[PDB]
Design a protein around this ligand. Structure first.
Ligand SMILES: Nc1ncnc2c1ncn2[C@@H]1O[C@H](COP(=O)(O)OP(=O)(O)NP(=O)(O)O)[C@@H](O)[C@H]1O
Ligand SMILES: Nc1ncnc2c1ncn2[C@@H]1O[C@H](COP(=O)(O)OP(=O)(O)NP(=O)(O)O)[C@@H](O)[C@H]1O
Ligand SMILES: [Mg+2]
Ligand SMILES: [Mg+2]
Lengths: 550, 550
């Protein structure tokens, strides 16, 4: 609906048309020059030669301005689809991204974008202009000279395309065979290199060389066959074009002898047919990978269509929240991660406002399931969840996400500065608040002990950090978010004792005048809970204070 | 020194020359046809047109037969260098392959071979033929018409190549910028995908999209600049060729007006210059990656030149060996794997013929160093090694390798059938001996319990196997080799007890009437040794039988 893109497309098509027109005009110019020189007074011939030169220069200019304009508009379009698909991809369920246990999604999306761009560019720069050229050639040859010339040029193009189509598959089979042979040789080389200790242990240094030589023959025959068939295809194309040129020139000469049309008219049709024939090898060399581009586009489309999982509901009502009330509770919670495997069943808690509640389990069965469920990653098909009297599934999503904050079991940090990771908790927060939160988290000492401090580079490719710093960063982010409800899922892996008391004190500071749900495996960390819940074989069996022991 | 390759090269060059000659003849043919039709009787014109067609067809045929012949000879050469470099690579020291802790060597060697082939093919198919074309054009234009035509065509080529060289670098800088921007965008996408849990934890789903959009601009500007500069370069080329054609045709017309040369001579020089100009864009599009091919070739050459490490000595005397004698011993052995770190020092053993000697150490300091040294992987610069009174360093290498057999600490198996791995111990061994050895090794029961048996596929990509089967395979290979001296370096990792007694019985069968050096960490495995050697802090301190305790 943007007129700018329509204007650019129209300009590109008009430039294509003008370019084809000038390409058609050029042989007319040459023929007029030849006739003028045959008649002889040289001023007219010089003018026609200058016209020939400027016409072909203008044709090239038109081609290239069309190329530049369409490149700009297409690349802008690629920027729009890529930006949209990125946001769309970051909306699916957690299960899909857990299944996609690789970073191949970025490669897939970029490959699809490049493939779409390549397909569009190849189509608009080859298919339409070549068909337009053929139509203009046929029309001008039929009107200027006769029907026979148009018929013979159409026949020449028909036999050329038929031959190319026939040879393409008979060559791609050999290409596939060579590719498989090369892969086999590479795998054999990998195995021989890997078994080098055993190779040295025995006398087998020449046997591996002989095997590699045999594999080199297996690749050799296919390579030779592919080269030979490529040469044969090129011969077919060139000979077809030669026969076409010879026939058209013979027809022009036969017309000349009768005196129907003037001498010097065969050279124009020769040049015109040849300039028609020029781009048909560029056509093939770009069609070579169009199938792969289309395959990549299909893969991207399928990945976009895996988006059938949508946890968002309709009628997004607002969430009424306040520091008081907000009594998180359950009602007959049953849920299964694995189809038919009751990981969690019969769970129902009761957390009053301002009270710290800690849940403790064994090796683990649903300990992190509470964190997953309360943040609305999965739907508890049985029972319900209550938050200030509001069901999780009956309220607008991202507002619920903003209401409750979580300190995760694990931690991942963006490949940026520490200050950016701290600020990630609240984008519109003042830097002074960020510094105060970081100081409150008991991390500023490690920041000043860092090689740089706030601006030090931390990431996967940055300097490595232990678990304690990541826990401090997560706690500080939770503080910066400032949620009325906090879910601290402390990591199962232990750390230094002093760090444990520091994080315990930090969490005690967090709990002040708010609701906190603690997950831990150490009794000393949960002695301060108002009520403690014990999880056994996926069920709740024990509730109460620390006086219940274990 | 093979006349076949010289004959093929001569045939290819002769076909190239004939092809260029025919390409030169074609415009002469067209000019003769034009003059014949201008004079008019049509039989001569028809004959000249037929000659034009057959001449251009023959020129294409000559090009392509040259292409096929040189492809064959070059690919054969590639097969020779690859086969030689594989054998040369499997001759270096163990340290180089330990340092090369990747399978990238095969990729490097294949990439280098393809790069050498590509460089040779591009050179022989573009540089020489184009220079020959230019020389023939200049000569024929100077002799047939005059010096001015040759001068102007040489000037046109000079300005074309100067413009292309000038624009190449100014475009490759933009190419580098675009490549870096694309890499940055991909890395940002990787980070955003990896931090998806933290993205969902907060409200930051649109912020990542905005950042990706900014990166898309950073890539966008470079892409647009590269497309624009490519279009500008193409305009420069086409306009230069247009000016050249216009100038040459104007000169031909000026010559025609004076009557010095006949009408219809401008079209021949036009077509001749254009067919000269035809391949100069193929030239650039193949030169695009010649630098990368040369870089790969340089990397392969450097890797071949890392071969300065050569443990082989001169004056390879034969090794006198017999089941008797062969008393392996040391004399003040000191060696350091890490420069300045005395891993092994002051080691001197004494193993009489037919006696089983076991060495036992702590966590490990030089336990496998004995296995490494006796098989001549490293040189003990201090002291000497005695084997039947023959120094290891003063005898031919691979015969010493064949004399002594080793059961390794670890094990690796070729990605082939079990029968092939068993036969790898002795290539020229009868299959019946292989079956008898396998049965003696206590493995045929597991073979018949296997899904297939002898022909089952076992490898990295095959079915996985535990350590016990690998140990049985190694023992059976050692039996098939049948060495007078055996060094059994039993793995530090333990296995099933019953498997331990079975392998102990197998080793006891091995020791019969031969010399065996055992390495183990279990006292029960070494109680049967004639004398036991205890290694402490890299030195020998305790020697004797089992009565010495520990
Ligand atoms: N995406 C998933 N699909 C299926 N099962 C899952 C998935 N994620 C986790 N589980 C299972 O959920 C069970 C309980 O998980 P969790 O709540 O983390 O307790 P835990 O991991 O066993 N104890 P802890 O290590 O302290 O968290 C585990 O045994 C997992 O096998
Ligand atoms: N290629 C090498 N370069 C440098 N140091 C090495 C190399 N190989 C081994 N070492 C070191 O030398 C020591 C001797 O290793 P080795 O002779 O295998 O006994 P071990 O590894 O100590 N114990 P075990 O597991 O019973 O073999 C090891 O501790 C290694 O760290
Ligand atoms: Mg957990
Ligand atoms: Mg060892």
């Amino acid at each position: 609906d943007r007129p700018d893109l329509r204007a650019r497309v129209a300009i590109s098509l008009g430039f294509l048309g003008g370019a084809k027109a000038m390409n058609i005009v050029v042989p007319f110019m040459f023929k007029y020059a030849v006739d003028s020189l045959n008649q002889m007074v040289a001023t007219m011939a010089t003018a026609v030669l200058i016209g020939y030169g400027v016409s072909r220069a203008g044709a090239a200019f038109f081609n290239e301005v069309r190329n530049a304009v369409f490149g700009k508009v297409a690349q802008n379009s690629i920027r729009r689809i890529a930006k949209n698909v990125f946001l769309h991809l970051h909306n699916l369920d957690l299960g899909f991204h857990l299944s996609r246990q690789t970073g191949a999604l970025s490669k897939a999306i970029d490959r699809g974008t490049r493939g779409i761009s390549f397909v569009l560019s190849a189509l608009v720069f080859n298919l339409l202009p070549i068909m337009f050229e053929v139509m203009l050639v046929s029309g001008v040859l039929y009107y200027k000279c006769g029907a026979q010339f148009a018929l013979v040029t159409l026949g020449t193009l028909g036999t050329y395309t038929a031959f190319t189509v026939a040879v393409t598959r008979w060559r791609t089979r050999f290409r596939i065979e060579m590719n498989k042979a090369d892969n086999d040789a590479g795998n054999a080389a990998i195995d021989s290199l890997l078994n080098y200790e055993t190779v040295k242990y025995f006398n087998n240094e020449r046997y591996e060389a002989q095997r590699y030589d045999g594999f080199l023959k297996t690749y050799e025959t296919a390579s030779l066959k592919s080269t030979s068939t490529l040469a044969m295809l090129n011969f077919g194309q060139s000979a077809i074009f030669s026969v076409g040129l010879t026939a058209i020139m013979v027809l022009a000469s036969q017309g000349i002898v009768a005196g129907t049309l003037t001498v010097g008219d065969l050279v124009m049709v020769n040049g015109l047919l040849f300039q028609l024939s020029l781009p048909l090898n560029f056509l093939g060399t770009v069609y070579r990978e169009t199938r792969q581009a289309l395959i990549d586009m299909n893969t991207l489309f399928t990945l976009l269509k895996v988006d059938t999982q949508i946890k968002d509901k309709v009628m997004a009502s607002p969430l009424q929240i306040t520091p008081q009330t907000a009594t998180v509770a359950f009602d007959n919670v049953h849920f299964e991660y694995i189809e038919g495997q009751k990981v969690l069943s019969g769970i129902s808690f009761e957390v009053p406002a301002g009270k710290k509640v800690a849940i403790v389990g064994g090796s683990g069965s649903g300990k992190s399931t509470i964190v997953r469920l309360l943040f609305r990653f999965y739907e508890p098909q049985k029972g319900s969840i209550y938050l200030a009297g509001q069901n999780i599934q009956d309220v607008s999503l991202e507002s619920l996400r903003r209401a409750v904050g979580v300190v995760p079991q694990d931690a991942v940090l963006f490949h940026n500065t520490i200050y950016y990771n701290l600020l990630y908790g609240n984008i519109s927060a003042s830097p002074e608040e960020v510094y105060a939160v970081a100081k409150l988290a008991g991390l500023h000492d490690a920041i000043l002990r860092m090689p740089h401090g706030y601006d030090t580079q931390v990431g996967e490719r940055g300097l490595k950090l232990s678990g304690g710093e990541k826990q401090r960063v997560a706690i500080a982010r939770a503080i910066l978010k400032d949620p009325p409800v906090i879910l601290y899922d402390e990591a199962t892996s232990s750390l230094d004792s002093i760090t444990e008391e520091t994080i315990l004190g930090a969490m005690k500071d967090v709990v002040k005048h708010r609701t906190s749900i603690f997950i831990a495996h150490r009794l000393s960390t949960v002695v301060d809970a108002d009520e403690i819940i014990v999880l056994d074989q996926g069920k709740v069996a024990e509730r109460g204070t620390h006086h219940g022991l274990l």
